Amino acid sequence: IREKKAEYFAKLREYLEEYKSLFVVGVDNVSSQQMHEVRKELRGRAVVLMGKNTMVRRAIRGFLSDLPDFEKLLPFVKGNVGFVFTNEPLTEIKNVIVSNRVAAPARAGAVAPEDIWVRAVNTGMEPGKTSFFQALGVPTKIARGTIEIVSDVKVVDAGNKVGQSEASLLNLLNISPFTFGLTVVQVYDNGQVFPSS
Amino acid sequence: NEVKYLYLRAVGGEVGASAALAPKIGPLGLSPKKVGEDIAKATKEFKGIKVTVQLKIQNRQAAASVVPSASSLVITALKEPPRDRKKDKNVKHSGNIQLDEIIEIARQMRDKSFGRTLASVTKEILGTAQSVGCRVDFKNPHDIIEGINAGEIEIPEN
Amino acid sequence: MVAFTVDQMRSLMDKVTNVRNMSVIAHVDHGKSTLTDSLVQRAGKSTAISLYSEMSDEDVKEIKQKTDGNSFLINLIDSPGHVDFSSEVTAALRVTDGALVVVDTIEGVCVQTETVLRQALGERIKPVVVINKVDRALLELQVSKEDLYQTFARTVESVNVIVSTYADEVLGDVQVYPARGTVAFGSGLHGWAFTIRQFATRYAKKFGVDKAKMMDRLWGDSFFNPKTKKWTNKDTDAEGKPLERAFNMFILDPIFRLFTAIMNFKKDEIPVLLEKLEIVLKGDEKDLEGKALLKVVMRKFLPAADALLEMIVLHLPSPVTAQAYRAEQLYEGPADDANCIAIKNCDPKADLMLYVSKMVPTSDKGRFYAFGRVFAGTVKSGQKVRIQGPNYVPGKKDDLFIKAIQRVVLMMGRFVEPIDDCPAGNIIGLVGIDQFLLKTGTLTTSETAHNMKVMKFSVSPVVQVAVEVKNANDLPKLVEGLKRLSKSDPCVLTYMSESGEHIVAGTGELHLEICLQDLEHDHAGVPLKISPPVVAYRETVESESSQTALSKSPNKHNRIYLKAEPIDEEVSLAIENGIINPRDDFKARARIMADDYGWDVTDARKIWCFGPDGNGPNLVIDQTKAVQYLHEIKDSVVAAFQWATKEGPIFGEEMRSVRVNILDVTLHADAIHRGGGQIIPTMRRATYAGFLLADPKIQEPVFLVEIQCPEQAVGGIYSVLNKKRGQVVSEEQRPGTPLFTVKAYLPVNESFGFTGELRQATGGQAFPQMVFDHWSTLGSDPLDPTSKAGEIVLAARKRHGMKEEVPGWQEYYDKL
RNA sequence: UUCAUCUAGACAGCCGGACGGUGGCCAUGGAAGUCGGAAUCCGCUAAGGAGUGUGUAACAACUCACCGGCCGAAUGAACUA
Ligand SMILES: CO[C@H]1[C@@H](O)[C@H](O)[C@H](OC[C@@]23C[C@@H]4[C@H](C)CC[C@H]4[C@@]4(C=O)C[C@@H]2C[C@H](C(C)C)[C@@]34C(=O)O)O[C@@H]1C
Ligand SMILES: Nc1nc2c(ncn2[C@@H]2O[C@H](COP(=O)(O)OP(=O)(O)O)[C@@H](O)[C@H]2O)c(=O)[nH]1
Ligand SMILES: [Mg+2]
Ligand SMILES: [Mg+2]
Known part of the structure; x- marks a missing residue:
C-alpha cells in the first residue's frame, strides 16, 4: 500500500518538474471510454494523471520545500479533478480537452437538466416499439412502415429525474441531453496558476 | 443515401444460414442469399474462424467488409487445417505463430486499439493468443509479455 | 325485419350489391355476442343472421363502393373468440368479406383479438374496429374524459400496429382510424355506439359547420378553444389552464354529462338535458331511475343498431367489390382461366362455384344441411352439380361426384327457409348433399373447375385422448357418433391408433372436453370413458449379439445359430418409403444397399424376407456357408421372422431396425423332421435370443x-x-x-x-x-x-x- | 484472542466512473462477463473480474467487485466463553 502511495508521489514529482504547464481538469460525469479517448488524443502532446485528492495534496505539501510554487495549486485540488501536464501551446491542449465530448444517453435516475421533448417526426423505428411510446403517452402512427410521433410531447420536465420508461424511449430515439467532457478549473504554468477563461 | 450499419459473426469461410441472416438485414429489403454469399467471400481466407462482418446498408447495398477480430486474425494466422465441425467437437487450437506474425496482427489492430506503443498492442494480441491457449515461439504469450516488460523482445515499432 | 316475406328476402338475395356478409371477431368476452344481438334486436356454432337496414341518399353518395338502391341486407356471423375454436372463425372468414373487430376498452387488444385480427389479415380481410364496454370505462374505472380518450388512442394504435405489421402489400391503406370513420365506440350491452362521423353529422344540424373536415378535427389533437372562436392545432397553454381537445369537449362531454346526471339522480336536471338531447319518452318510462334510465336514454340518443350498421354499409365491402382482390388467393390455379376470373366478375350467370363450409345440424340425426357462400352463377333447387374433393386431382377420376341438389335453404336464427335459387355472392344452405363430401370442398357445374382453397387454419388437432364404450354391444353407436361429429365439428380429428384405440383429437383442453361431452351425451348417446392414449413403441437392438443365439428343435434334430444387428435408421427409412421394396429384385435392389447404404452386396443379395407385415423395416440375412437343405426351411424361417417381428419379446410390439443374420443351421435329412412345426418355433426362439443378447x-x-x-x-x-x-x-x-x-x-x-x-x-x-x-x-x-x-x-x-x-x-x- | 484498515483519509452512508483488445477459447439450436468446461492475459489505467448479481432466446439494459467525489477518527473480520 505505502509502496504504491510512494510510487504515486514519485510520479507526481516527475510530472511536476518535467512539464512546465498543467491543467486542472474536472472529470465529473466523464466516463472511462472518454478518458481513454482523451489519453489517446493528448498522447505525444500531453499526459493525464489522476489520483486521490488527499494523496495529491499531501504529496504536494511534502514537495513544497523544493517547489513552493504549487502552494497556489493546492487550493484547486477539490472535487473530481485531475492533472493534464503538457509541453505544448496552452490553447491547443485546452481546445482538445474541451473538444472531446460525449452525448451520454439518458440513464434513469439522473436529474434531467432541461425539459425533454419529443417532436412530430417519423422516427424510422420498427412498429413493434410502439409499447414505449404508449407507456410514455406519446401519440404515434405507423407511416411508411415506421413509427411517427404524431404530436409534440414533453416527456419529462426540467428538474424531476428521468424515469425508467422515459429513459427507454430516450435511448430508443437517440435523445440525449447530457454532454460530458473534461472541464478546466485552472491552469498551472511556470510557477503561475491562472484561470482558464 | 442513408448509411445503415450492422454486424454479424458468421463462421469463417462457412456459408451463413438464412435463419441467421434474414432477421437482421431482411427489413431493409436485401436477399439473405446474396448477403450470405458476400460473408463467405469476405471470410474466404478466414475459413474456419468466425469474424465480425461490417455491413453498410447504403440504399440497400451489400457491402460486406470483415471487421478484424483479434481472435479471428490470431487463429487464421495459426493457419490450422480447416476446423471441421463435423470431424470432431471441441476443436483445440495450438498454432505457433511467430513473433513477427503477432506484430503484424498488432499493426492491423493498433488503429482500432488503445495501447500506447506498438509494443503495448503486441501485448494485447499476445493476451488474446494466451486466451486461445496456443503455443507461440515455443513459449507462453504471458512469458512473452514478461519479456517485453523486462525489455527483452525489442519491438519493431512501425 | 319482422318476417317481412319469403319472396321479399328472395329479392334481397337477388340484389348482389346491398348485401354484406361479414363476421364479428374479438377476444373471449369482449362483447361480440352482445353487439351482434343488439344488431339483430331490431331485426325481429356460426349461423348467419339477417338484418334489414334503410339508408339515405347522402350517405349512399358517401360510399366508395359500386352500388345501386337505398336499402341494405346484413348477413352477420358470430364467430367464436376462444383459441380452441380458432377454425370456426376461419371458416366464417373464408365465407365472409368484412370483419368487425370488437376490442374491449378496459382490457385493450388481448391475445385472442390479436390472433383473430392476424387471421383476418392473412385472409386480407379489411377490418373495422369497435371499442366496447365504454360504459364499463365510465362506471368502473371512472375515467374523466382524457384517460378515456388516451385509452381509445392506445387501442387504435395497437390495432394499427397489428394491421401495419400483417397487411399484405395489396392494400396498404387498410390501417384503421376513427378519423376515417372505421373505428366506433360504444356499449354493446347497453345498446349505444357512435362514430365521430356520426357526431360531425349530428352537429351540422345545429351549428351549420362543415362535415367534410370536422370529422378529422373531432379526433386527435384539435382544440376548438372557446372564448376565442378558433380551431387551434396545439395546446398553446390556453394562456393558463390548458384547454381540452375537440373529442372530449364535443363527443365525450355530453356523454359524460348524461352519465353524471342520470347516475347522480338529479331529477330536476334529467328532463332538461334529455330535452336538450332530443329524446322521446313513454307512458311509464318517465318513471325510470338510474342504472337503467341512462341505458334507455343512450339507446335512444345513440343507437348502436345505426352506428354499427352505417360503418358496415360504408367501409365493409360488398361481394361484387371484394371478391376481386381475394380470388387470386382463394384459387391456387393460375390467374388466366375462366373459372378464376368468374369469381372476380361475381357474375350470377357463369359456371357455378359454391363452397360448402359447415355441416349444420337439422334437428334430425343424419341430414346435415350444407352451409355455404355462392361465388359465381346461380344455384337452383334440383340443379346438376359436381362435388369436388379437398385432394381431388382434376386430371383423372378422383373425389368428384355426379349427384345433384335437393332443395335450396336460407338459414336464419334457427329456422330454414326453403328457396329455389340464389345468385352469386350470397349465403345459403344446400339440402341433399354433403353425405358425399367429407369435410369441405366446392360444388361446381364446370368440367375444368379447379377447386378453391382448402380453408387452412392456424390451429390443429394436438390434444389426443382415447375413448371406449363400456357396453361393447353399443360400439356401433360409439363409432356412429364418432364419425357424426368428425364432420359437424371441422377441426376434430379421429382415427385408430397403432394400438387399437379410438383417438379423439382436438385443438385444446376446452375444445376436446366439448367434443368428448358431445360423444358421451348427444352425438353417440352411450356412456363411454376416456384415457390417455397408449404410446405404441418399437423394439430394436443397439449392439451386435455378443454371443451366437442358438435354438434346437422340439425333436432336437435341427439347430439354428444366428446373431442380431442394428439396421441403420437410413436403411429403415429406405424400407418404409420404398427405396428398398420387398417386391424388388435382388442384385438390383441389393446394388442400392451396396452403393448407397454401406451394405455388403453379398448380404444385401442374401435377404430372405422383410418384417413385420411382410414389408417392414426388419431384415433376415443368410450368413451361412454350404448347408445341405437350407432352401427347404426358407418358408418356415420367413414365417417365424414375421412372428418375431410382429410380436417382439419385450412387450409384443413390432420390431424395428433389426437385422437377423442366420450364421448356421443344422437340419435333419428327412423333410418330415424339418417341417414347419420343427423350424418355426426354433427360428422364432433363436431370433428372440438374438434380440435379448444384442443389447435390447x-x-x-x-x-x-x-x-x-x-x-x-x-x-x-x-x-x-x-x-x-x-x-x-x-x-x-x-x-x-x-x-x-x-x-x-x-x-x-x-x-x-x-x-x-x-x-x-x-x-x-x-x-x-x-x-x-x-x-x-x-x-x-x-x-x-x-x-x-x-x-x-x-x-x-x-x-x-x-x-x-x-x-x-x-x-x-x-x-x- | 488473533489478524487486518486507518489524517498518504479508514468503516458505513450519498454521488461519479465501472472501459478497450473482446461476440477471449471451446462447445451450444442460441450463450455477447453471468446454463456450462478451461484459461484467469494485456492496455488505458485513479479503476475495473475475460466478471458479483438481476435480466434476454441471444441482445440490450441495470448492479456489484475495483477506483474516485463528500465527511472526518477511528473501524472491520474470524474466533473464544
Ligand atoms: C393428422 O394427425 C395425425 C398426425 O399428425 C399425428 O402425428 C398423429 O399421431 C398419432 C401417432 C402416430 C405415430 C406413428 C404412426 C407411429 C406411432 C404412432 C403414435 C404412437 O402410438 C405416435 C403418434 C401419437 C399416436 C398415439 C399416441 C395415439 C400415434 C399413433 O397413431 O398410434 O396421427 C394423426 C393421425
Ligand atoms: N358493461 C358492459 N358489459 C358488457 C358489454 N358487452 C358485453 N358485456 C358483458 O360481457 C358478458 C358476456 O359478453 P358476451 O358478449 O356474451 O361475450 P362474447 O362471446 O365475446 O360475445 C355479458 O354478461 C355482458 O354483461 C358492454 O358494452 N358493457
Ligand atoms: Mg360468444
Ligand atoms: Mg444468460
Missing part, C-alpha cells in the same frame, strides 16, 4: 412440432421444452413480423398436456402443430424394471396381462 432397447415415436410464438413467449417455449425433454431444433423469424417459428422434436410420451403447459407458459400466444416424424431409440435399458425405458415396458406387461419379469436370454436359448 425400445424406440418411441417422436412428434415434430412447430410453434408460431412471438419474442415474449419464446422463453416459455424453451421452458416447456426443456421441462418435457424436448430438443430445440430450429428458430426463425418471419420477414417483417415479430411472430417467431420454433421447430422441435417432442417425444410422444411426454406430449400429453403439453399444449396446455405451453399455452400456460406463453399466455396462449404459442400456436403449436404436431405430426409424427420418426422413432428415437431410448438410451436406457428396457429390461431393468426401474430404468427410464424399463417402466413403460412394465406398464405394457400389466396392461396386456402378461407376466412382470421379462423372459431372460437363457430362455429361447438351448445350451450348446
Whole structure:
C-alpha cells in the first residue's frame, strides 16, 4: 500500500518538474471510454494523471520545500479533478480537452437538466416499439412502415429525474441531453496558476 | 443515401444460414442469399474462424467488409487445417505463430486499439493468443509479455 | 325485419350489391355476442343472421363502393373468440368479406383479438374496429374524459400496429382510424355506439359547420378553444389552464354529462338535458331511475343498431367489390382461366362455384344441411352439380361426384327457409348433399373447375385422448357418433391408433372436453370413458449379439445359430418409403444397399424376407456357408421372422431396425423332421435370443412440432421444452413480423398436456402443430424394471396381462 | 484472542466512473462477463473480474467487485466463553 502511495508521489514529482504547464481538469460525469479517448488524443502532446485528492495534496505539501510554487495549486485540488501536464501551446491542449465530448444517453435516475421533448417526426423505428411510446403517452402512427410521433410531447420536465420508461424511449430515439467532457478549473504554468477563461 | 450499419459473426469461410441472416438485414429489403454469399467471400481466407462482418446498408447495398477480430486474425494466422465441425467437437487450437506474425496482427489492430506503443498492442494480441491457449515461439504469450516488460523482445515499432 | 316475406328476402338475395356478409371477431368476452344481438334486436356454432337496414341518399353518395338502391341486407356471423375454436372463425372468414373487430376498452387488444385480427389479415380481410364496454370505462374505472380518450388512442394504435405489421402489400391503406370513420365506440350491452362521423353529422344540424373536415378535427389533437372562436392545432397553454381537445369537449362531454346526471339522480336536471338531447319518452318510462334510465336514454340518443350498421354499409365491402382482390388467393390455379376470373366478375350467370363450409345440424340425426357462400352463377333447387374433393386431382377420376341438389335453404336464427335459387355472392344452405363430401370442398357445374382453397387454419388437432364404450354391444353407436361429429365439428380429428384405440383429437383442453361431452351425451348417446392414449413403441437392438443365439428343435434334430444387428435408421427409412421394396429384385435392389447404404452386396443379395407385415423395416440375412437343405426351411424361417417381428419379446410390439443374420443351421435329412412345426418355433426362439443378447432397447415415436410464438413467449417455449425433454431444433423469424417459428422434436410420451403447459407458459400466444416424424431409440435399458425405458415396458406387461419379469436370454436359448 | 484498515483519509452512508483488445477459447439450436468446461492475459489505467448479481432466446439494459467525489477518527473480520 505505502509502496504504491510512494510510487504515486514519485510520479507526481516527475510530472511536476518535467512539464512546465498543467491543467486542472474536472472529470465529473466523464466516463472511462472518454478518458481513454482523451489519453489517446493528448498522447505525444500531453499526459493525464489522476489520483486521490488527499494523496495529491499531501504529496504536494511534502514537495513544497523544493517547489513552493504549487502552494497556489493546492487550493484547486477539490472535487473530481485531475492533472493534464503538457509541453505544448496552452490553447491547443485546452481546445482538445474541451473538444472531446460525449452525448451520454439518458440513464434513469439522473436529474434531467432541461425539459425533454419529443417532436412530430417519423422516427424510422420498427412498429413493434410502439409499447414505449404508449407507456410514455406519446401519440404515434405507423407511416411508411415506421413509427411517427404524431404530436409534440414533453416527456419529462426540467428538474424531476428521468424515469425508467422515459429513459427507454430516450435511448430508443437517440435523445440525449447530457454532454460530458473534461472541464478546466485552472491552469498551472511556470510557477503561475491562472484561470482558464 | 442513408448509411445503415450492422454486424454479424458468421463462421469463417462457412456459408451463413438464412435463419441467421434474414432477421437482421431482411427489413431493409436485401436477399439473405446474396448477403450470405458476400460473408463467405469476405471470410474466404478466414475459413474456419468466425469474424465480425461490417455491413453498410447504403440504399440497400451489400457491402460486406470483415471487421478484424483479434481472435479471428490470431487463429487464421495459426493457419490450422480447416476446423471441421463435423470431424470432431471441441476443436483445440495450438498454432505457433511467430513473433513477427503477432506484430503484424498488432499493426492491423493498433488503429482500432488503445495501447500506447506498438509494443503495448503486441501485448494485447499476445493476451488474446494466451486466451486461445496456443503455443507461440515455443513459449507462453504471458512469458512473452514478461519479456517485453523486462525489455527483452525489442519491438519493431512501425 | 319482422318476417317481412319469403319472396321479399328472395329479392334481397337477388340484389348482389346491398348485401354484406361479414363476421364479428374479438377476444373471449369482449362483447361480440352482445353487439351482434343488439344488431339483430331490431331485426325481429356460426349461423348467419339477417338484418334489414334503410339508408339515405347522402350517405349512399358517401360510399366508395359500386352500388345501386337505398336499402341494405346484413348477413352477420358470430364467430367464436376462444383459441380452441380458432377454425370456426376461419371458416366464417373464408365465407365472409368484412370483419368487425370488437376490442374491449378496459382490457385493450388481448391475445385472442390479436390472433383473430392476424387471421383476418392473412385472409386480407379489411377490418373495422369497435371499442366496447365504454360504459364499463365510465362506471368502473371512472375515467374523466382524457384517460378515456388516451385509452381509445392506445387501442387504435395497437390495432394499427397489428394491421401495419400483417397487411399484405395489396392494400396498404387498410390501417384503421376513427378519423376515417372505421373505428366506433360504444356499449354493446347497453345498446349505444357512435362514430365521430356520426357526431360531425349530428352537429351540422345545429351549428351549420362543415362535415367534410370536422370529422378529422373531432379526433386527435384539435382544440376548438372557446372564448376565442378558433380551431387551434396545439395546446398553446390556453394562456393558463390548458384547454381540452375537440373529442372530449364535443363527443365525450355530453356523454359524460348524461352519465353524471342520470347516475347522480338529479331529477330536476334529467328532463332538461334529455330535452336538450332530443329524446322521446313513454307512458311509464318517465318513471325510470338510474342504472337503467341512462341505458334507455343512450339507446335512444345513440343507437348502436345505426352506428354499427352505417360503418358496415360504408367501409365493409360488398361481394361484387371484394371478391376481386381475394380470388387470386382463394384459387391456387393460375390467374388466366375462366373459372378464376368468374369469381372476380361475381357474375350470377357463369359456371357455378359454391363452397360448402359447415355441416349444420337439422334437428334430425343424419341430414346435415350444407352451409355455404355462392361465388359465381346461380344455384337452383334440383340443379346438376359436381362435388369436388379437398385432394381431388382434376386430371383423372378422383373425389368428384355426379349427384345433384335437393332443395335450396336460407338459414336464419334457427329456422330454414326453403328457396329455389340464389345468385352469386350470397349465403345459403344446400339440402341433399354433403353425405358425399367429407369435410369441405366446392360444388361446381364446370368440367375444368379447379377447386378453391382448402380453408387452412392456424390451429390443429394436438390434444389426443382415447375413448371406449363400456357396453361393447353399443360400439356401433360409439363409432356412429364418432364419425357424426368428425364432420359437424371441422377441426376434430379421429382415427385408430397403432394400438387399437379410438383417438379423439382436438385443438385444446376446452375444445376436446366439448367434443368428448358431445360423444358421451348427444352425438353417440352411450356412456363411454376416456384415457390417455397408449404410446405404441418399437423394439430394436443397439449392439451386435455378443454371443451366437442358438435354438434346437422340439425333436432336437435341427439347430439354428444366428446373431442380431442394428439396421441403420437410413436403411429403415429406405424400407418404409420404398427405396428398398420387398417386391424388388435382388442384385438390383441389393446394388442400392451396396452403393448407397454401406451394405455388403453379398448380404444385401442374401435377404430372405422383410418384417413385420411382410414389408417392414426388419431384415433376415443368410450368413451361412454350404448347408445341405437350407432352401427347404426358407418358408418356415420367413414365417417365424414375421412372428418375431410382429410380436417382439419385450412387450409384443413390432420390431424395428433389426437385422437377423442366420450364421448356421443344422437340419435333419428327412423333410418330415424339418417341417414347419420343427423350424418355426426354433427360428422364432433363436431370433428372440438374438434380440435379448444384442443389447435390447425400445424406440418411441417422436412428434415434430412447430410453434408460431412471438419474442415474449419464446422463453416459455424453451421452458416447456426443456421441462418435457424436448430438443430445440430450429428458430426463425418471419420477414417483417415479430411472430417467431420454433421447430422441435417432442417425444410422444411426454406430449400429453403439453399444449396446455405451453399455452400456460406463453399466455396462449404459442400456436403449436404436431405430426409424427420418426422413432428415437431410448438410451436406457428396457429390461431393468426401474430404468427410464424399463417402466413403460412394465406398464405394457400389466396392461396386456402378461407376466412382470421379462423372459431372460437363457430362455429361447438351448445350451450348446 | 488473533489478524487486518486507518489524517498518504479508514468503516458505513450519498454521488461519479465501472472501459478497450473482446461476440477471449471451446462447445451450444442460441450463450455477447453471468446454463456450462478451461484459461484467469494485456492496455488505458485513479479503476475495473475475460466478471458479483438481476435480466434476454441471444441482445440490450441495470448492479456489484475495483477506483474516485463528500465527511472526518477511528473501524472491520474470524474466533473464544
Ligand atoms: C393428422 O394427425 C395425425 C398426425 O399428425 C399425428 O402425428 C398423429 O399421431 C398419432 C401417432 C402416430 C405415430 C406413428 C404412426 C407411429 C406411432 C404412432 C403414435 C404412437 O402410438 C405416435 C403418434 C401419437 C399416436 C398415439 C399416441 C395415439 C400415434 C399413433 O397413431 O398410434 O396421427 C394423426 C393421425
Ligand atoms: N358493461 C358492459 N358489459 C358488457 C358489454 N358487452 C358485453 N358485456 C358483458 O360481457 C358478458 C358476456 O359478453 P358476451 O358478449 O356474451 O361475450 P362474447 O362471446 O365475446 O360475445 C355479458 O354478461 C355482458 O354483461 C358492454 O358494452 N358493457
Ligand atoms: Mg360468444
Ligand atoms: Mg444468460
